[PDB]
């Protein structure tokens, strides 16, 4: 059970946005809390990562990129979880102090990606998604986005990824289920893409609509996010 012993142990506890649920919902109110939460969650995604099984294999640059590349898609996924486990997919549980409704979904001008994300959370329930299945699916996602130029140490990565999936074969132990899980893992990317698009654009227009970006998130959005959007850095899909 070791591999799960790990993931359970290292699983970061849910973090808050510090958002003001007394103040009215507005676009700028909402989107200065999701950039702060993103940075907060990222800080938990770094810790989490470093302690993963065999992740200190990799060239420190590949360690770093892969996180910046897979950061959005992960966050969604544990929101996929958090929304499902806490609110039964009626609402989005980005955090305890920033659970999203339809009004917020619209005020945030993120409505589409947001339906998509509830649908995900719905598919968490539809499909009997267990927590161990959740941890190794979430673990997997870290290794779900590469330069098609490949990595500096691409061989370690190829093999590392092979094992995290082997771990996901065993959590099921049959092939019927895999297809769906995979299929789901695959349903993360289009979203993380759409968001990445919105984020990007939002950064670009940030000075004009009164929305606050953390000195660090702007880097990732301006330097690493765009490699994804230009097609230099692709998702690894299971299907099609």
């Amino acid at each position: 059970p070791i591999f799960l012993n790990v993931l359970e142990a290292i699983e970061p506890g849910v973090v808050c946005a510090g958002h003001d649920n007394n103040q009215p919902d507005s676009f700028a109110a909402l989107l200065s809390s999701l950039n702060e939460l993103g940075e907060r969650q990222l800080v938990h995604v770094v810790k989490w990562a470093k302690a993963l099984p065999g992740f200190r294999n990799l060239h420190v640059d590949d360690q770093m990129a892969v996180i910046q590349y897979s950061l959005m898609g992960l966050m969604v996924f544990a929101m996929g979880w958090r929304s499902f486990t806490n609110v039964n997919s009626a609402m989005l549980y980005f955090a305890p102090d920033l659970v999203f409704n339809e009004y917020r979904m619209h005020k945030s001008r993120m409505y589409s990606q947001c339906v998509r994300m509830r649908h995900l959370s719905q598919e968490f329930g539809w499909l009997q998604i267990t927590p161990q299945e959740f941890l190794c699916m979430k673990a997997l996602l870290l290794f779900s986005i590469i330069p098609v130029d490949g990595l500096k140490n691409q061989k370690f990565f190829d093999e590392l990824r092979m094992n995290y999936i082997k771990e996901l074969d065993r959590i099921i132990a049959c092939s019927r289920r895999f297809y769906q899980l995979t299929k789901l893992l695959d349903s993360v990317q289009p979203i993380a893409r759409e968001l990445h698009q919105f984020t990007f654009d939002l950064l670009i227009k940030s000075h004009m609509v009164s929305v606050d970006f953390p000195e660090m998130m702007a880097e990732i959005i301006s330097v690493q996010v765009p490699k994804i959007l230009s097609g230099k850095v692709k998702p690894i899909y299971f299907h099609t």
């Binding site: 770094v46 770093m64 660090m216």
Partner: peptide, 8 residues
């Protein structure tokens, strides 16, 4: 160099 590589 970069802020994300610094923190790491």
């Amino acid at each position: 160099d970069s802020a994300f590589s610094r923190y790491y």
